[PDB]
Amino acid sequence: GSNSGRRSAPPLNLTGLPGTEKLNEKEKELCQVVRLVPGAYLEYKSALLNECHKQGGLRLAQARALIKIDVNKTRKIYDFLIREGYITKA
């Protein structure tokens, strides 16, 4: 009936907050794995979709030194957009 955005398993940092719903079940688990928050993961991810679409071809390494701070973090977010039909890894 109405759109629902909740589960039963033990979440991490995307439970009881805003944005977690805007994330699809794919992005939802994406954050529940890489302990992050919606508005932030949406911010970092927003910087990728905008820097990847601006030029067109983007690399996964360039993202590691671009957003977040280390790499395992950008690796998970970018790995989604990359392998997905969103940004690029060239």
UniProtKB/Swiss-Prot annotation:
GO molecular function: DNA binding; transcription coactivator activity; zinc ion binding
GO cellular component assignments: ATAC complex; mitotic spindle; nucleus; SAGA complex
Effect of K73A: Reduces DNA binding
Location, primary (coarse class): nucleus
Domain SWIRM positions: 3-90
Alphabetically ordered keywords of this record: Chromosome, DNA-binding, Isopeptide bond, Metal-binding, Nucleus, Phosphoprotein, Transcription, Transcription regulation, Ubl conjugation, Zinc, Zinc-finger
Compartments where found: Nucleus; Chromosome
Example GO BP: regulation of protein stability
DNA-binding region(s), residue ranges: 73-82
Subunit composition and interactions: Interacts with GCN5. Interacts with NR3C1. Associated with the P/CAF protein in the PCAF complex. Component of the PCAF complex, at least composed of TADA2L/ADA2, TADA3L/ADA3, TAF5L/PAF65-beta, TAF6L/PAF65-alpha, TAF10/TAFII30, TAF12/TAFII20, TAF9/TAFII31 and TRRAP. Component of the ADA2A-containing complex (ATAC), composed of KAT14, KAT2A, TADA2L, TADA3L, ZZ3, MBIP, WDR5, YEATS2, CCDC101 and DR1. Interacts with CCDC134.
Function: Component of the ATAC complex, a complex with histone acetyltransferase activity on histones H3 and H4. Required for the function of some acidic activation domains, which activate transcription from a distant site. Binds double-stranded DNA. Binds dinucleosomes, probably at the linker region between neighboring nucleosomes. Plays a role in chromatin remodeling. May promote TP53/p53 'Lys-321' acetylation, leading to reduced TP53 stability and transcriptional activity. May also promote XRCC6 acetylation thus facilitating cell apoptosis in response to DNA damage.
Protein name: Transcriptional adapter 2-alpha
Lineage: Eukaryota, Metazoa, Chordata, Craniata, Vertebrata
Covered residues, full protein: 355 to 443 of 443
